[PDB]
Design a protein around this ligand. Sequence first.
Ligand SMILES: NC(=O)OC[C@@H](O)C[C@H](NC(=O)[C@H]1NCCC[C@@H]1O)C(=O)N[C@@H](Cc1cnc(N)[nH]1)C(=O)N[C@H](C(=O)O)[C@H](O)c1cnc(Cl)[nH]1
Ligand SMILES: [Mg+2]
Ligand SMILES: [Mg+2]
Ligand SMILES: [Mg+2]
Ligand SMILES: [Mg+2]
Ligand SMILES: [Mg+2]
Ligand SMILES: [Mg+2]
Ligand SMILES: [Mg+2]
Ligand SMILES: [Mg+2]
Ligand SMILES: [Mg+2]
Ligand SMILES: [Mg+2]
Ligand SMILES: [Mg+2]
Ligand SMILES: [Mg+2]
Ligand SMILES: [Mg+2]
Ligand SMILES: [Mg+2]
Ligand SMILES: [Mg+2]
Ligand SMILES: [Mg+2]
Ligand SMILES: [Mg+2]
Ligand SMILES: [Mg+2]
Ligand SMILES: [Mg+2]
Ligand SMILES: [Mg+2]
Ligand SMILES: [Mg+2]
Ligand SMILES: [Mg+2]
Ligand SMILES: [Mg+2]
Ligand SMILES: [Mg+2]
Ligand SMILES: [Mg+2]
Ligand SMILES: [Mg+2]
Ligand SMILES: [Mg+2]
Ligand SMILES: [Mg+2]
Ligand SMILES: [Mg+2]
Ligand SMILES: [Mg+2]
Ligand SMILES: [Mg+2]
Ligand SMILES: [Mg+2]
Ligand SMILES: [Mg+2]
Ligand SMILES: [Mg+2]
Ligand SMILES: [Mg+2]
Ligand SMILES: [Mg+2]
Ligand SMILES: [Mg+2]
Ligand SMILES: [Mg+2]
Ligand SMILES: [Mg+2]
Ligand SMILES: [Mg+2]
Ligand SMILES: [Mg+2]
Ligand SMILES: [Mg+2]
Ligand SMILES: [Zn+2]
Lengths: 83, 127, 62, 24, 60, 206, 99
Amino acid sequence: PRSLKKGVFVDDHLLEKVLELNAKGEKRLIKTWSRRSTIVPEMVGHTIAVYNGKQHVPVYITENMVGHKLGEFAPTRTYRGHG
Amino acid sequence: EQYYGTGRRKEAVARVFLRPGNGKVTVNGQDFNEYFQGLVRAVAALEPLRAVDALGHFDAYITVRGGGKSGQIDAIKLGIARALVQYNPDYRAKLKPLGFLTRDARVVERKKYGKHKARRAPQYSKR
Amino acid sequence: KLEGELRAEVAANIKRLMDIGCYRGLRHRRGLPVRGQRTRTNARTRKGPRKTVAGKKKAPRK
Amino acid sequence: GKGDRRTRRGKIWRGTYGKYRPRK
Amino acid sequence: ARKALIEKAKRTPKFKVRAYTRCVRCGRARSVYRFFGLCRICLRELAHKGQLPGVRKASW
Amino acid sequence: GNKIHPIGFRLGITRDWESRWYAGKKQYRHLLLEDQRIRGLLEKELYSAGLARVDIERAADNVAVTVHVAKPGVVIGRGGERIRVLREELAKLTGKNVALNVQEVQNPNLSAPLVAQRVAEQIERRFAVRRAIKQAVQRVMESGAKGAKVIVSGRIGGAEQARTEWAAQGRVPLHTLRANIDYGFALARTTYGVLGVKAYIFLGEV
Amino acid sequence: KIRIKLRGFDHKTLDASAQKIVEAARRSGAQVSGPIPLPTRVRRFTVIRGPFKHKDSREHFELRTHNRLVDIINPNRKTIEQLMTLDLPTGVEIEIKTV
RNA sequence: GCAUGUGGUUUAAUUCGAAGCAACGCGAAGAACCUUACCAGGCCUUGACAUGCUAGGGAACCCGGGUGAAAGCCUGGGGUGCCCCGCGAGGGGAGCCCUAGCACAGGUGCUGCAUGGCCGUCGUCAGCUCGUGCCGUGAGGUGUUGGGUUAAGUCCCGCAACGAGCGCAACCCCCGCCGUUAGUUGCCAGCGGUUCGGCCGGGCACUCUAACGGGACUGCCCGCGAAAGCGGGAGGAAGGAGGGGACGACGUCUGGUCAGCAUGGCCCUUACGGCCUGGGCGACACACGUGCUACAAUGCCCACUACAAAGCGAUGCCACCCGGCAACGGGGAGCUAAUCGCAAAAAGGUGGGCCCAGUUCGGAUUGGGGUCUGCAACCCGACCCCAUGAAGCCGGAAUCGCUAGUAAUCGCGGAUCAG
Ligand SMILES: NC(=O)OC[C@@H](O)C[C@H](NC(=O)[C@H]1NCCC[C@@H]1O)C(=O)N[C@@H](Cc1cnc(N)[nH]1)C(=O)N[C@H](C(=O)O)[C@H](O)c1cnc(Cl)[nH]1
Ligand SMILES: [Mg+2]
Ligand SMILES: [Mg+2]
Ligand SMILES: [Mg+2]
Ligand SMILES: [Mg+2]
Ligand SMILES: [Mg+2]
Ligand SMILES: [Mg+2]
Ligand SMILES: [Mg+2]
Ligand SMILES: [Mg+2]
Ligand SMILES: [Mg+2]
Ligand SMILES: [Mg+2]
Ligand SMILES: [Mg+2]
Ligand SMILES: [Mg+2]
Ligand SMILES: [Mg+2]
Ligand SMILES: [Mg+2]
Ligand SMILES: [Mg+2]
Ligand SMILES: [Mg+2]
Ligand SMILES: [Mg+2]
Ligand SMILES: [Mg+2]
Ligand SMILES: [Mg+2]
Ligand SMILES: [Mg+2]
Ligand SMILES: [Mg+2]
Ligand SMILES: [Mg+2]
Ligand SMILES: [Mg+2]
Ligand SMILES: [Mg+2]
Ligand SMILES: [Mg+2]
Ligand SMILES: [Mg+2]
Ligand SMILES: [Mg+2]
Ligand SMILES: [Mg+2]
Ligand SMILES: [Mg+2]
Ligand SMILES: [Mg+2]
Ligand SMILES: [Mg+2]
Ligand SMILES: [Mg+2]
Ligand SMILES: [Mg+2]
Ligand SMILES: [Mg+2]
Ligand SMILES: [Mg+2]
Ligand SMILES: [Mg+2]
Ligand SMILES: [Mg+2]
Ligand SMILES: [Mg+2]
Ligand SMILES: [Mg+2]
Ligand SMILES: [Mg+2]
Ligand SMILES: [Mg+2]
Ligand SMILES: [Mg+2]
Ligand SMILES: [Zn+2]
């Protein structure tokens, strides 16, 4: 995991959009590309559409899904089975 | 007073110093038998003496560096024989029969490319 | 925390992950590797024994 | 036991040091 | 060795870590030797020409 | 996938390097590329003068570029002007004190790189390829040489079928190490495509 | 008092140059520890021969930086005034440290 | 069982080539972004790069805001240099910049069956040929064949042949013995001083380091043979090519590669060019190839104790102290290095444990907690510690390697490289 000295990593510009959405009490959909961002408890209850290489898919953020990074909730490849 | 002989064997170099007396032998600041603690081969190193009958009539101050201990053994073993002749040029006659003056030319073979090992070719298996 | 009381926590830990709907979740669900291994070969301890299927005729003719 | 990362052999082969094969 | 990527190669990039070497000659990305800034093709070629100084052919 | 570059084989035994200097790991990378930028330019700018070798000796902030050329006047220039222009443009691209001297390849018939070239030109100028070769090899042996060999390969003539022509006289002992053997290679660039000329010249047993 | 290291690629020129320095220090009034052959640091390179595939053929090149030490104890002035007048091989680097 | 490559299938994309030996740990000696050629999305259009040209606006250049995932898009200020004419206002000009338009650049788009170069290959196999003479109407033969010998078209005898060229051999490198020159950062034999470390004096003997040399020729003896040469012995460190390297003949494969580079021809030019962010190359009902680790007692674990070589490193290797189970972190000496370091060599040796068990064998898989690199470890890094402790009890039909310091076995280094 990420070293504990440097805290966690979220892209400033996603963290940006939420603080404005919090410090105004608004719950409007967000889209981003930075899968790579951790999930601070500040994001909780929001909805973030994240890129999976093709589209943005909504990801409602509940409590228990905080330690993780956003990408874990939009798989990148499509699988059915073999026929 | 001393008699020297320089024995090498396969990346090992032995420095043999002979001085008559009891029979005791030092390698690298330890007793011969403590240095080669549990090595069977070790005894062979003192075959050059035994085959001229001068074991006991000498001591040895020896040093080795390089190789594994066995390599050091056949190097000492050379070095002693090399030394028995600077002392007594007539000893050659006794040693050359079993060829104790012969530097073992044998040595580790260059790893060659496209092999795994110099010879050990990679496996061809199936079709 | 020991015995079956520990089996509890590990079990309900994976359970969490599936219920979350995260990647490691799906991998657990579908019985695939989880820490990121290859699957085009090996990956056997996760999928148990080998369910051989049909296949084709390569490369020239037969 | 070269695959066993809890032996001297284990760390010897992985080229690492740990509890089970420390430096000095 | 598409032209742009030889130039991009030189562009000091947004992060220290997109630093990558190509061959000062062909521009080849892949088998590039630090020490010469040449690939293992170019190395071979210039070595035979005699234009890499003190670079002999080995043999032991 | 056959024969070894006759030079790199003999290199250090019967044949010398075209760059002679020392450099530690730190500096080498760039003094190399600096040489290659020099040899890049002088090669373009002097094809007219028929140039065999570009020697690059080096000190510290010093470069002794010896240029080996058939027609040494063409390099010099009328008045002495052309050489000054080079030396400045050199010391521009180098940013060091370039010391460019000129050396008269007294006999282009025993310079493989030149024999090579002369043929390639001939091939470009649309000359008969077979004759072109026998007649080149000819000229080489006529001038002392102990052996010689020229290989043109590619779309010979117009030719849909790319083949290979070659010819030799005397001994050209590519296996014999002590054999001084000059090699040179020329590339002919043509409306129908590109062909390569190798020329080997056996010069003397050492 | 004056210690000269000699590092170059070609060992003929390297060795030659060092003779031109063992004698320079003689004809000027001093004794000398001879040209000592320090070990030589080889840099090997192992390129695949062909351009594409065919990994099972390589070619081995090396880069041999040769090292000679030379010491001039009892260093006079008629010594130094015969050293900054030499320089005769090109591919040899000199470094002088009065230690 | 796992690591990699591949077939297939799947996919928005799983970039592309390699395809019997001679494709499959192969191009890749380093795919998280980059690489990167594929896919999705947002962007630029004389373009990220070359040399220019016509017309206008500008010194070049420097810093800040807006929007944005970034790219890009819009916008604010600072700045007036140089060359010529002039007293000056100022006109002209070089360079660089922007806008419009034109030559054009760019293309890892196609064709390796249009090519160069380089390589794989039969094959380090002993062959492939030419001048003259000779045989034959001629294609062609002779020589090169035959008998002996050889690793060898290597030599001997023979012969219508006598030679020669490319090949074999030799000249080059490493290893094995000795010499001369050389004494530091290496070395310690007798000696002086010792904090017991070659540490200090001192010395180069020895080891070594590394530059030049000597040495081996079937030379000697016996036996066989017209000869070449073969068997055996002596002296010798080495004996009949002493061991290993580099070195690939005329040609074959329409072999490989337009994706290293180069290049003919065909194709695209606000798109097949270029920038970016994200995804992919890592997908998984399956199949093969190459390998790692094992299935254990000639073993496993823990402790103590020995003996290497080759490399690498002053943007780095990091000794020693400290915290920490540890990865590692903080402090910090030496070293541009025969000095300082990486560095513990592991098998081995001595002691003790386990006692035939899916085990103190095996270490997959997963849960949890950390470390480091990196803008960033979800897809997809390695490492540490706790817990989990799968298959596997020596492998069917088939099949591979190796003839001596070889195989088997055990560790060590390096290239690429932030990792
Ligand atoms: N390189 C090379 O020579 O081959 C070597 C080996 O791989 C053979 C290969 N063998 C196998 O698969 C077998 N091995 C085990 C797996 C399965 C199978 O049982 C193969 O494919 N054989 C048949 C198959 C077949 C049956 N029917 C069609 N149409 N094909 C074939 O294709 N023959 C060709 C022909 O009939 O012409 C071929 O071109 C050939 C020409 N001369 C010979 Cl001899 N062979
Ligand atoms: Mg922002
Ligand atoms: Mg070995
Ligand atoms: Mg060796
Ligand atoms: Mg291989
Ligand atoms: Mg191995
Ligand atoms: Mg175990
Ligand atoms: Mg191109
Ligand atoms: Mg990189
Ligand atoms: Mg050929
Ligand atoms: Mg060709
Ligand atoms: Mg080969
Ligand atoms: Mg593929
Ligand atoms: Mg292609
Ligand atoms: Mg890799
Ligand atoms: Mg990518
Ligand atoms: Mg990208
Ligand atoms: Mg004026
Ligand atoms: Mg003015
Ligand atoms: Mg093009
Ligand atoms: Mg082809
Ligand atoms: Mg093909
Ligand atoms: Mg006739
Ligand atoms: Mg024949
Ligand atoms: Mg042969
Ligand atoms: Mg012959
Ligand atoms: Mg004493
Ligand atoms: Mg001293
Ligand atoms: Mg020698
Ligand atoms: Mg005879
Ligand atoms: Mg040969
Ligand atoms: Mg083809
Ligand atoms: Mg891949
Ligand atoms: Mg299987
Ligand atoms: Mg501690
Ligand atoms: Mg530390
Ligand atoms: Mg041990
Ligand atoms: Mg025991
Ligand atoms: Mg079982
Ligand atoms: Mg059992
Ligand atoms: Mg054999
Ligand atoms: Mg290793
Ligand atoms: Mg490294
Ligand atoms: Zn290149």
